[PDB]
Each structure stands twice: as C-alpha cells, then as structure tokens.
Amino acid sequence: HGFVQNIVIDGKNYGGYLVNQYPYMSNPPEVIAWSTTATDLGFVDGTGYQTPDIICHRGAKPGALTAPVSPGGTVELQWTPWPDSHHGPVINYLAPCNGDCSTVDKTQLEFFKIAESGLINDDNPPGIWASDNLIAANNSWTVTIPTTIAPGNYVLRHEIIALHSAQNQDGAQNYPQCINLQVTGGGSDNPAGTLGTALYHDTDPGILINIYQKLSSYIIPGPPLYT
Ligand SMILES: *[C@@H]1O[C@H](CO)[C@@H](O)[C@H](O)[C@H]1NC(C)=O
Ligand SMILES: [Cu+2]
C-alpha cells in the first residue's frame, strides 16, 4: 500500500495527488497527477485488468496540469514508504494525449513501455526486486524520457506490481500512478501502443507466480519495451 506523493522535474517539486487528503476536500487543488478514488492506498488486482481502473488506478480522472520535461530529462517519482514485503517489478509507460492531457478519454490511451525493472537478485528468495531498488533509493524512482519519441503531451503511467500474494489467481497487486508530461525535443518515433485493458492478464507468467520459491527467470509483465 502506498502512492506517489511528489514528482521532481528540472529542479522543482510538482505535488502529487495526495489520495489520503484531496478526496476529503471537495474543492481540491489542480496538480499534474491524476485524481483517483483509491483512498485505501490499495491496488487494482487481476479482477480489474480489463476494467478502466487498471489504466490510471480506481476512478481515475486526468490531472488539470502538465509538467514540461527537458529533452531526455528525468522525472523522479517519490512514493510513501514502500513495504519490503511488496516485492515486484516497477514499470513505466507513456501514452500520447494528442492534445491537452487534462481532456483525454483514458479508455482510448495506447501505452508504450519505456522502462521495466524486475527480479534483480534471487540469492535469498523471495529476492531483491525493482520495488527493493525503490526502497533503497528512499522510495523514489527516476524515469528518463526517451529523446527518440515525437514530442507532445503524454500520460506517464508509473507502476509497482506487488507479488507477495501472487501465487493465487488475482493475487498480484497493481499500483499505477499517472502524471501529465509535456515531452520536448527533436524525436519522431510514434511507438506501437497497447490499450490499458490489454497491458496485463491475470494468468501472465510474471503475474500468477510464487516468488517465495527459487526463480530461474522473471518475465516482466506488459507489452514489449520500446527502444
Ligand atoms: C534514507 O534517508 C534517511 C535520511 O533522511 C536515512 O536515514 C536512510 O538510511 C536513507 N537511505 C536508505 C538507503 O535507506
Ligand atoms: Cu499493500
């Protein structure tokens, strides 16, 4: 359980969607982060993979604001403290807004994977995962925006998948957090994109998995990494 509390871009903080404050406020502030109804600080499990909830989390609506990023710039997402128990991958996608992200139909967004990190070491099962790298970095993740994509407005879909309960059907816990970015620079690629509801299926090999046993490999879920 947790959420993204702050985003650092080009030397300033953009405050996150504080899901334990703003849903209680009823005139809440404009941010680059999507609003959600996930006030339990919880997840979308396999029952929700073909519902709109998987796209940017339960009940999500676009952020009003968009943050500009320098060409090949960093976006640092700062989480609430991630529990060591919640081992699993950290995955990052962009989808083009083709206009103001604040007005997109989330159900039409087509994501391409720009970064993935999975099982790092398995010397002591359940091992060390991208989620453990996030904890070791004091609960932040750094995303480098590619220089090779067409600039424009994009949703960054940033996600931890916790696998501590994932040996059961629908046990994996997805924690997507979306923010609005203005990608800048000279790129031209329009990578093939995947609908939110086709990212994951509840029987995928990196989704329905016992992490407590020795693992020889881990297949990071979702569509193929764009390079
Ligand atoms: C996180 O930062 C705090 C100090 O603010 C420190 O005490 C902690 O050990 C840091 N780093 C890691 C790897 O946990
Ligand atoms: Cu949890």
Cβ < 6 Å from ligand 1: which residues? 136, 138
Largest CA distance in the chain: 50
d(CA 125, CA 211): 7
Best probe residue, ligand 1, of 78, 131, 138, 139 (max atoms within 8 Å of C-beta): 138
Residue 138's CB is within 10 A of a number of other CB atoms, namely 9
Beta-bridged to residue 173, according to DSSP, are 162
Q: Whose CA is nearest to atom 10 of ligand 1?
A: 138
d(CA 77, CA 182): 16
Question: Nearest-CA neighbor of 91 among 214, 191, 219?
Answer: 219
Which CATH number belongs to the domain containing residue 225 in this structure? 2.70.50.70
Binding residue positions for O2: 164, 173
Radius of gyration of the chain (CA): 17
Q: Could you write out the three-class secondary structure of the chain?
A: CCCEEEEEECCEEEECCCCCCHHHCCCCCCCCECECCCCCCCCECHHHCCCCHHHHCCCCECCCCCEEECCCCEEEEEECCCCCCCCCCEEEEEEECCCCHHHCCHHHCEEEEEEEECEEECCCCCCEEHHHHHHHCCCEEEEECCCCECCEEEEEEEEEEECCCCCCCCCCEEEEEEEEEEECCCCCECCCCEEHHHCCCCCCCCCCCCCCCCCCCCCCCCCCECC
Binding residue positions for Cu(2+): 1, 86, 175
Beta-bridged to residue 115, according to DSSP, are 92
* Beta-sheet pairing, 67-69 with 128-129: unpaired
Q: Which two tokens mark 158?
A: 């940033």
CA quadruple 218, 52, 143, 135: dihedral positive or negative?
negative
For 85, the domain range is 2-227
Q: Are 118 and 129 in contact (CB under 8 A)?
A: yes
Read off the amino acid at residue 2: G
Q: Whose CA is nearest to atom 3 of ligand 1?
A: 138
Q: Whose CA is nearest to atom 2 of ligand 1?
A: 138
* Beta-sheet pairing, 119-121 with 194-195: unpaired
Does residue 126 have a cis peptide bond before it, meaning omega lies within 30 degrees of 0?
yes
Question: Nearest-CA neighbor of 87 among 163, 183, 186, 15?
Answer: 163
Read off the amino acid at residue 214: K
Beta-bridged to residue 110, according to DSSP, are 195
Resolution for the entry shown, Å: 1.5
* Number of domain units in the chain: 1
d(CA 102, CA 141): 24
d(CA 47, CA 227): 31
d(CA 180, CA 67): 6
Q: Which strands sit side by side in the sheet containing 67-69, from one edge to the other? A: 67-69, 173-183, 152-162, 90-96, 110-117, 194-195
Q: Are 203 and 81 in contact (CB under 8 A)?
A: no
Q: Are 129 and 98 in contact (CB under 8 A)?
A: no
Question: Nearest-CA neighbor of 128 among 142, 139, 138, 118?
Answer: 118
For residue 138, the ligand 1 atom closest to its alpha carbon is 1
Q: Are 152 and 97 in contact (CB under 8 A)?
A: yes
